Amino acid sequence: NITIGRGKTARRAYGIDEIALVPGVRTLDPALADTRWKVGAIEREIPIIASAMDGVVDSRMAVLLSELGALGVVNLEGIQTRYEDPNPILDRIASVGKTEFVGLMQELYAEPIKPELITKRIQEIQAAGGIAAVSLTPVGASKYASTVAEAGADLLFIQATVVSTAHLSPESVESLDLVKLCQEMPMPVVLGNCVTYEVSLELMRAGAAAVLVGIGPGAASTSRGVLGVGVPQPTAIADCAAARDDYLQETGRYVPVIADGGIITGGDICKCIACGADAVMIGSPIARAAEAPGRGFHWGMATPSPVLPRGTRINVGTTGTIREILVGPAKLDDGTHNLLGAIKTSMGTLGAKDMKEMQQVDVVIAPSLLTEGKVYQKAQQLGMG
Template identity: 30%
Template sequence: MAQIITEVSRTFNEFLLLPNRTRTDCSPATVDLRTPLSRHAVGERPAVELRVPFTSAIMQAVSTPELAIALARNGGLSFLHHNRSIQDQVAAVGQVKNVEAGAVTGAATPHSDARPDDMTRPLVGAGVNTHDYRERVPALADAGVDALCFDSSDGYSDWQAEALAWVKKHYPEIPAGGGNVVDGDAFVFLAEAGADFVKVGVGGGSICITRDQKGIGRGQASAVLDVAAARDAYRERTGVHVPVCSDGGLVHDYHVALALAMGADFVMMGRYFAGFDQAAGAKLATRDGFVKEYWGEGSNRARNWQRYGQGGQGLLFEEGVDGYVPYAGDLGEGLALTVAKLRTTMVSCGSATLEEFRSSARLTLVSDQSFQGSHANVALRAASPAVH
């Protein structure tokens, strides 16, 4: 009979952080959000480090060259999508890497021994697949890509392990991540195959219907906690830290803090970035304000032959939908607000670094009534009250 996992599959909405003692030297201005993107020996510098723990999803509706440049300027990294010809993806990478020095601030590494290229070019990643990686990866490497990520709704497969092993053999200098997974066994499988980071999340994205269609997935909080525990055990056993990326299920800004507290080294978001000016979706006016188009890579609109069949076979069923997200303005302004919230949350938890946050954070489960009590419960006024 099937194995039954008795632990409840939990989402971020079911948790809150408990405050810890805040030291006098711990303030939002002193919080250090640097985090590794690539595997490294404990105590050594990773090949790629982010200044803020944010990456944008490998999606047509999200990661444009314009968004990649803006996110790099603010310390994060975008993964340009691969559902197109190799030439088109290479051109998109080149568009980002050709930004001149002086325009990029967040991409520069804080280390004094920084490579010259780190100081003059924005960081950019690229999604790849298990079909044409032998042709696509060399071209992306020549274009100067800083990181690769194998993109699959289910990365616990021999195909992905073989592809990772090939990339690490031929291009060991380029970090290559794997995923997606939802449990510790899958993490170890990809880490031992050579993954430089492992992406966590199946079915939790706002645009994803994998759970409805296939009955596969896991609550994102449970998945991150399980994989992070396996990551820590792997580090203890091997002396190597393989970063964990939480991908999907991040509905509110505070969910980012929860994901990081639960063990993620960085997060990947689609819906969040899709609302900014720099994302690909068209900006449309509605009765209630502006929105931007947003669609999943598993939707018919994406025409993602690399995931769902080649040779004109087409998409047998969808694992994503086509919709809209609220318009969010400029990425720099929006991300600055999210980062400010993250910094103040960490201060309330007495943490000045992400490593300290992961090791000392305390989490409590939330009942449905407690969750409802977390929100405002008054009639909000549309305008200021009259002055008497």
Template identity: 40%
Template structure:
């Protein structure tokens, strides 16, 4: 039963919970973390760890996608980002970092980011980025917005992508386009493709269920909210309590599973995951995997040079993010971020190791079983 709170005469709001509001409660016999599996499968593609990288130029270059893929995760290239617009992306990123580090004009980095994103997309550049990842033998995934999905997808399919990610701050099963353009009906769109589609973000049970009915292989919950980097709350007034949102989407998955007689759609959490404990709690709430942004951007392999910004920061008229410094001094390797060893007592390194140990302490051997672990809400 939903917990409704009266916020004024005739107006109620639902009480919801963040990941920080809940705790995992072990209640079974413990097991060795070596007996725990963190693998999961999305359509025909199997991954050793439940980690995707947020599709921002600050994080996912073709080389980073390859490195994450070799370690069992999935790097998602932003199909509308700099890798498809400029041949010298490394130089452009260095320019952005220099502007951010100068601290003379706090708005200058975002202005420059918008200018760089205003350059036309060049199909050859994007195809080359896709080919680089594909030729390395790892799963190739590219993100497009609902507004541009119909126009960009054919060239991505020709380039050889394995997975398509239709991703926006908040999306629905049908996107109403501007002017005389035909609305994007995701169900029709997905049915015409030969590759699996992951779609999101969503914020509630109803929207998640509608997206599952489109034929999506996975549904993203959240919009990548990151304290200090995303400003969607300030700009749009939209907030997303991740613990509740994930649990709602997991309930939609159960309903859809019953509705279809067995079709399982993966729930992917995207937002407010800054530590290995947060990752464990996201899985415990019902997620099959999680999108990480700033936590991965600290890695030496990330192209942002110790800085992070979400893909929404480049919006031409309503930017919803800023450049955030995430690493100072020597940056850890991606191996240390994912699997350790860690010397940080707060969970910013060894994400997968922390998740494995949480599962082991709770007595669960795989991710789907761990979704049944007991939870409590802090008073």
């Protein structure tokens, strides 16, 4: 309904920083707020998945997250499957200057994937009592999905900027048949990323166990600057949640919508749930953990592209343990600790008893939410500033 100019129309899309949540007609104690989600047969108390990023998730973090009631995804195309000991490599990435990290990563990530390390990472996480969740790009799945199946991973994430049931490739590159993959894999398969109703619906029809929503909102993402592609998160989430609801009516199958990236605070999580997300996928808030493999740094997994980097490396620092970050007690005033407590406290304030009710809360378009009254916080770099 918007005219850009003669013969070119558009629709308005809203970002995470443009919306706010409105109380209902009841309130509830946060201890009564049910935050569960489920993917396949796996129920989780914390509706947070740590991103498949080398500054965020290694084997230890995947286990720690699982034990807290959350999940972490190991990237099978990152350093974890290229080096038997990733630690010196992670140290090098964290130690070089702002003008050196692109070139360094272009080199370090050229070391080949060792399929024996795909098996090892999965089996060590499972041996330790963790849920083993692993990612591959569509081309990576053409080569290694059978290795993941043989290893017996609990969840497979096929994730890239876009993942399509209608991908055109030169005949030398094996395009991935997502319908065949979902049917043949012995575990649930999460597909993404997408930002539209039409694509999310197609991914669900192909057999996805969950869909990942988001193109470019990430803190370490440069895709929107490199390509111009993206839909801001509230709008993308709502459109994909509508596809979930239509797919549920058509088949009786519930495919959760995961809002992926661009989340820093508990308020950001809540705003994503209120737009329809069943769960969120976050990286930068978890890269701030004492146990995070990034050593206080966080980088995009397309930063090492040898031809066109589409991520950067940022310094997020280290603010607490992963336990403090997910379940507190919070040590900070900015909503970046005790993320589960923040979700339950927000649901309580809004009267939302469970995640489905949270997705039904009233929303306002409120670009002044993060700026009204905040001049001192911005000037002094405190609180929200």
